[PDB]
């Protein structure tokens, strides 16, 4: 038994979200076929199901905007969520439920971001004052960005933080490294930022007073 979610990684506010679950190793004309989502912060919300017979159940919190449909000829079932806001940003999971047991088989999940922003590459600004240095990788969209230090030669003492979604609707993150304070005057430190979605690649020397 395998389930697999598909659909867009991004939609705009007020637009419809439409996802698909493709099922193999089992017939959707038996059992219960569910949609579940995980918000940032790790809160889980049960959304609803379509059953073996085609009867559905919807969570009252979503009942106005949700539709679960199926196509038995393809062994697929579908989630439609109307009128999305930035609070529908979540990982969406399809899952089979076995009567009496629970959600026994899950898909890998699909990350959905709700955002009116267009693809934009990051600006990379240096963070300069054991000592710490870093880079502020700012105003990009969408995720992800990858950050490395000295072309991946430096990994120890590195902390690359989770991105935060700013009030403008663009992402920002910081990546920092801690190093011997004695090595500040003799060695050099460059952060290497890659943003594949916007084809942007930036190397930034983090220079300091010492």
């Amino acid at each position: 038994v395998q389930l697999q979610e598909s659909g867009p990684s991004l939609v705009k506010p007020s637009q419809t979200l439409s996802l698909t679950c493709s099922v193999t190793g089992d017939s959707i004309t038996s059992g219960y076929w569910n949609w579940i989502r995980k918000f940032p912060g790790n809160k889980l919300e049960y959304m609803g199901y379509i059953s073996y017979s085609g009867t559905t159940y919807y969570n009252p919190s979503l009942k106005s905007r949700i539709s679960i449909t199926r196509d038995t000829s393809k062994n697929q079932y579908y989630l439609q969520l109307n009128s999305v806001t930035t609070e529908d940003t979540a990982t969406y999971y399809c899952a089979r439920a076995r009567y009496g047991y629970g959600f026994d088989y899950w898909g890998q999940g699909t990350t959905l971001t709700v955002s009116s922003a267009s693809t934009k590459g990051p600006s990379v600004f240096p963070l300069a004052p054991t000592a710490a240095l870093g880079c502020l990788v700012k105003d990009y969209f969408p995720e992800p960005v990858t950050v490395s230090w000295n072309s991946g030669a430096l990994t120890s003492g590195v902390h690359t933080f989770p991105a935060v979604l700013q009030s403008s609707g663009l992402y920002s993150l910081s990546s920092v490294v801690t190093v011997p304070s004695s090595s500040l005057g003799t060695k050099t430190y460059t952060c290497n930022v890659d943003h594949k979605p916007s084809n942007t690649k930036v190397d930034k020397r983090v220079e300091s007073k010492y």
């Binding site: 790790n42 889980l44 969570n59 300069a128 989770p162």
Partner: protein, 208 residues
């Protein structure tokens, strides 16, 4: 209908017992799930007390009326993740908020660093000031921005790393965002950090 899990963060040492409580708001299809990092949620317990297939015997569920408990009798590193209770007896079907199982270690005070906005950034009409709290434990930390001793709010954002797999510490960045105009209006920028490992709060600062 409402499912309340306690606690939401549960420190444990490897080899010790962990207990997670789940209270339902009324009165049996009660299940427990685990989501480990980088994978989907997984069924552990069904019908209150029954272990699902492939689930180790160190996992056991029990419960009276309205009060349900998951016990992990000798915690292993593979057991670290987020645990959820779930009820499927009454509509709507509801999960508890989730309990994150993390590793205990000794209290460690953050090393605090402040970073002024770069000249490169200032030329584009935005100013970001960054406070780093490095390698601390426990996770609970308060960061307060002060601009000429005026307490700031609503204009800073925090990001926290997951628990470090080598030293079990956390790190945290806080970013104060301002316009260049408002940045140039003031001189002294400081972040004040409060944490269990600090006997009183530490302040790091600079002058524009």
């Amino acid at each position: 209908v409402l499912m309340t899990q306690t606690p939401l963060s549960l420190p444990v040492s490897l080899g010790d017992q962990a207990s997670i409580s789940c209270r339902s708001s009324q009165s049996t299809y009660l299940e427990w799930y685990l989501q480990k990092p980088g994978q989907s949620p997984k069924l552990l317990i069904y019908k209150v007390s029954n272990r699902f297939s492939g689930v180790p015997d160190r996992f056991s569920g029990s419960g009276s009326g309205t009060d349900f408990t998951l016990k992990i009798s000798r915690v292993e590193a593979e057991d670290l993740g987020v645990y959820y209770c779930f009820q499927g007896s009454h509509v709507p079907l509801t999960f508890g908020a989730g309990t994150k199982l993390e590793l205990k270690r000794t209290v460690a005070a953050p090393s605090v660093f402040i970073f002024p906005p770069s000249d490169e950034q200032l030329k584009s009409g935005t100013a970001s000031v960054v406070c780093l709290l490095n390698n601390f434990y426990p996770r609970e930390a308060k960061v307060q921005w002060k601009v000429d001793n005026a307490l700031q709010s609503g204009n800073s954002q925090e990001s926290v790393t997951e628990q470090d797999s080598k030293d079990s510490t956390y790190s945290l960045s806080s970013t104060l965002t301002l316009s260049k105009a408002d940045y140039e209006k003031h001189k002294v920028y400081a972040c004040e950090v409060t944490h269990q490992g600090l006997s009183s709060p530490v302040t790091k600062s600079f002058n524009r």
